[PDB]
Amino acid sequence: ENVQEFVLKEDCELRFAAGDDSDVCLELVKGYAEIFGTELLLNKKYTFPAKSRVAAFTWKGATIELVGTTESAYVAESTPMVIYLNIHAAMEEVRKKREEQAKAKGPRLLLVGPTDVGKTTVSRILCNYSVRQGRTPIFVELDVGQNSVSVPGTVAAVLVQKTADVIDGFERNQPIVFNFGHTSPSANLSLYEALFKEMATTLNAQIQENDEAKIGGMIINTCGWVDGEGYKCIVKAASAFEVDVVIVLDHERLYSDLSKELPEFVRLTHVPKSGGVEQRTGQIRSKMRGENVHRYFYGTRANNLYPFTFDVSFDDVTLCKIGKLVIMEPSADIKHHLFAFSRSTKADENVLKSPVFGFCLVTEVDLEKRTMSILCPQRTIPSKVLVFSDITHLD
Numbered sequence: 001e002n003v004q005e006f007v008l009k010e011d012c013e014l015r016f017a018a019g020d021d022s023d024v025c026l027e028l029v030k031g032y033a034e035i036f037g038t039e040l041l042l043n044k045k046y047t048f049p050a051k052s053r054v055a056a057f058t059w060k061g062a063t064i065e066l067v068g069t070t071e072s073a074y075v076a077e078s079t080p081m082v083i084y085l086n087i088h089a090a091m092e093e094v095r096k097k098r099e100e101q102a103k104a105k106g107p108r109l110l111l112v113g114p115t116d117v118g119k120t121t122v123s124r125i126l127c128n129y130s131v132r133q134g135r136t137p138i139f140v141e142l143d144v145g146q147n148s149v150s151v152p153g154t155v156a157a158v159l160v161q162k163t164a165d166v167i168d169g170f171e172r173n174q175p176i177v178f179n180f181g182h183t184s185p186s187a188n189l190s191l192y193e194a195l196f197k198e199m200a201t202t203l204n205a206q207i208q209e210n211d212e213a214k215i216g217g218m219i220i221n222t223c224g225w226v227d228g229e230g231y232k233c234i235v236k237a238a239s240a241f242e243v244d245v246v247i248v249l250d251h252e253r254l255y256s257d258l259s260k261e262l263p264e265f266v267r268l269t270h271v272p273k274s275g276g277v278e279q280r281t282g283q284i285r286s287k288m289r290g291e292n293v294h295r296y297f298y299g300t301r302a303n304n305l306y307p308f309t310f311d312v313s314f315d316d317v318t319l320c321k322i323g324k325l326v327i328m329e330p331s332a333d334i335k336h337h338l339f340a341f342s343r344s345t346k347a348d349e350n351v352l353k354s355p356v357f358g359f360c361l362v363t364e365v366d367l368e369k370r371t372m373s374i375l376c377p378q379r380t381i382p383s384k385v386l387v388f389s390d391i392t393h394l395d
Ligand SMILES: Nc1ncnc2c1ncn2[C@@H]1O[C@H](COP(=O)(O)OP(=O)(O)O)[C@@H](O)[C@H]1O
Pocket: 015, 016, 053, 054, 055, 113, 114, 115, 116, 117, 118, 119, 120, 121, 122, 146, 224, 274, 275, 276, 277, 278, 279
């Protein structure tokens, strides 16, 4: 209940972090402002939980109130927001040109760069800006570590029809989700690459049946792995998704290399990272993976989910594992692991390329009763083919 007031000139952003113990309430009291591309409503109170990192930007100028203990709060005057806006502008230009020559295929954009340069944040701003233009782009999440669509260990895609919630991020409206099963692509690089392609193939077939999605195009977020084998992932992602535009954030050498390698038709743009982007340690990142898993089952402060715990007979499910498909015996070592419900009706070669229904968490294993307790988003298992993930979570 301490109060801070901020006057933001045009093209300025208030960056703040909520206290370690404290909620911070933000209210726009004059003008117009947006948080990572989502417009703030005048006088609406936005409660951010402890440790939240937030940036509120304004094009024309704003006055903003914060109520609560903050670790840091300052106004920055020079951001790359204009750059990020012109990227959206050029995408929409491409949409119109292709519309006037047509079903029109929307432009596809790949965001690349090392850890903590703001690829996710920029993907969010671009998705929001497209929605505010009246478009429905497809957001494609290839980061199996820091995943904003599903649990970690997935490659996923979602049609974006609403701007992100300011506090909770995007609504996960019926995502297409593939179970990769690891927090980094180097754990099985060829499987990771096969999922890209199966994802790209699936999306190409789906947009055939939906013109809005088709002209919406794609914003594709990669992980921060740019060196060695990560570089080749970028080239194969570019190719498999047939991208028109590669945005490289804060990596001149990557940009140089990609310019010499990509098809000449590919427009490549190097842009700086924002001064507000925060370096995150392995610990913080591990904690964020845990909170992602937690959110998948329980939702948010704003939007609670109510997941079911029940027992499942080992005679009613087949547990399997990728690394080719192998059938698993119920064992004590599956405890705390995620399992994906495979859309594939049988435990065969189709599992590898099949998207999934969702996940459960194995909370207990009773070997003698031949049962396991699972946490599950629904009352009854949506599939009897359960695919192992190396991601674990103590609840
Ligand atoms: N302009 C900004 N102001 C404050 N925090 C930011 C800003 N841009 C990014 N961040 C934060 O910095 C962190 C890293 O950004 P992110 O987009 O997740 O990096 P990357 O996706 O490249 O790994 C995130 O916690 C994000 O919320």
